[PDB]
Amino acid sequence: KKGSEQESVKEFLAKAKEDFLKKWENPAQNTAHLDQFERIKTLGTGSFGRVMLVKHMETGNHYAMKILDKQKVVKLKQIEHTLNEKRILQAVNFPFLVKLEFSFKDNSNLYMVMEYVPGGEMFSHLRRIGRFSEPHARFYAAQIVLTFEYLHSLDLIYRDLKPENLLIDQQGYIQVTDFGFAKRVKGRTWTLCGTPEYLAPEIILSKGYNKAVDWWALGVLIYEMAAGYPPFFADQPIQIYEKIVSGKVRFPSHFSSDLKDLLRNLLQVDLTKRFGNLKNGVNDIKNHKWFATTDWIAIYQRKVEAPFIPKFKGPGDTSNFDDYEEEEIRVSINEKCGKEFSEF
């Protein structure tokens, strides 16, 4: 069970935690200004606001800029979640986590300037193709496993895993982009947050929960990638919650024996039995039969040939993204919610 490989992982994670804590305790703040970027096109939207493709004039580099309206964040009671999002993203460093390059704020908005991931959302490719073959889903799943091992070792819980929040880079690798619900917490937490299809039973049942919710969400992701549909779906969220808590899951007939076995252990209502939550931690997942062909080091090093490479017309191309309604940014002459977002 315990080997030199696990010892090298432990050592790598200890140094990664040293790097994280320095940035966590002393966050980067006010590293650019809105006027340093040319706003091109909206890549996505949320209740949070919008993410736009931008060009940094000084370098000619393209970036994705998230714009959050401070008044809307306050009305939606997302102040603490927004402060968590930026404090965490500026402090993390892993090959499958999008990099935050700059952050700043003005009278009206908060801004996060991140690397632009041009391949589009996994959601877009998954819905268009229908489903991914088991080796295709395994390649993406392996990246999430490593990412969660890294995040959890830093006492971070992710809480928003889904194809809509995973982007495909130029090399066909995953970039986790959405940290709106990420939280640094040592004990248990209670916030009702996430997406209906991805919620662990303990979240629905209003129990104190922990990082085991991310392992249940990985089970949902793997199922959705391999089936083309989620394990729990219905027209209304209440019907989805009834299915999640029931203790019943059905697998397509094309799912391999190893895939169903892994999913039964991830989509496990019983926390004393859920993979990722046992004495052996992440190793119950990494060493599962479905992952036998996975070379964890080669994935981390990005040496594995991706099963799918997105089409790239050139720099600034957004063909891999849907079109969204555009709206001009308005900066008030009066500072809004200054005290609430002082640390941003």
Binding site: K162, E164, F181, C193, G194, T195, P196, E197, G228
Partner: peptide, 18 residues
């Protein structure tokens, strides 16, 4: 089929967080 039921559902588009 389960796929046809999923495709005919109102939850095949981008899903909002709760």
């Amino acid at each position: 089929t389960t796929y046809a039921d999923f495709i005919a559902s109102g939850r095949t588009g981008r899903r909002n967080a709760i």
